Amino acid sequence: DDFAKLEEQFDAKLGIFALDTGTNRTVAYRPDERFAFASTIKALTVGVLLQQKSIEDLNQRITYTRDDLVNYNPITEKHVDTGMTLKELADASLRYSDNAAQNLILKQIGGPESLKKELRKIGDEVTNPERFHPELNEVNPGETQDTSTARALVTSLRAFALEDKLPSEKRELLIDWMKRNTTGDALIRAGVPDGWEVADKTGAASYGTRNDIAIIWPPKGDPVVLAVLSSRDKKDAKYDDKLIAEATKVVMKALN
Ligand SMILES: CC1=C(C(=O)O)N[C@@H]([C@@H](C=O)NC(=O)Cc2cccs2)SC1
Secondary structure, three states: OHHHHHHHHHOOEEEEEEEEOOOOOEEEEOOOOOEEOHHHHHHHHHHHHHHHOOOHHHHOEEOOOHHHOOOOOOOHHHOOOOOEEHHHHHHHHHHHOOHHHHHHHHHHOOHHHHHHHHHHHOOOOOOOOOOOOOHHHOOOOOOOOOEEOHHHHHHHHHHHHOOOOOOHHHHHHHHHHHHOOOOOOOOHHHHOOOOOEEEEEEEEEOOOEEEEEEEEEOOOOOOEEEEEEEEOOOOOOOOOHHHHHHHHHHHHHHOO
């Protein structure tokens, strides 16, 4: 198998699920295997935020301090004195994987347990948010806290971005943020021809966990929704982006 081969080449475990929303054809490989979801959860978290707020309500300004900043704060670290609006925090979380921005958003929607409950409400019984940054990224093999599966992430991303868990105006915000992600150029985007629009959210965590979930719009036709998840056996393992890009090429061929 080509996915087997990639696991062999990169000494890693792959979880793949892809759904062609036009034909309902799928590609699956360990689709129900749990991984730490890492930063991919940011995309569903903005999903819930959008559901719970009007678009105008996203203009509420959040005051924060150094105490709210954590390990990776590319946008939030610049605006402690002014604060940021919810809209600006959603942009920072989604486009730069700003961890403080995700923590602030999570607090505004009622914390990890509240996020879990809202995910259950949209039909996701798999994804298990429990912790804030930075703790959520430390997941040992066999533990379920802060994990999901490729199938569940695809199903939930679809629900928010493409189906009816959000009104069109809010779907458009979400899709536009993910389309202009700056963190993903070496992953799913790198397995898809230039010029196909891709909306994605990346993650990275311990045990060399390296994830990307995306919606891909092919030259006309309906979009594909894809999760590529990976992990490795040693806690301090490095990852390689190229695994995700090569996995994406295998998916596109299998759907073509
Ligand atoms: C590189 C990276 C990303 C990303 O590419 O999406 N997002 C942030 C977050 C979510 O996955 N990861 C962490 O905070 C944990 C880390 C792993 C490696 C360095 S920090 S910060 C680390």
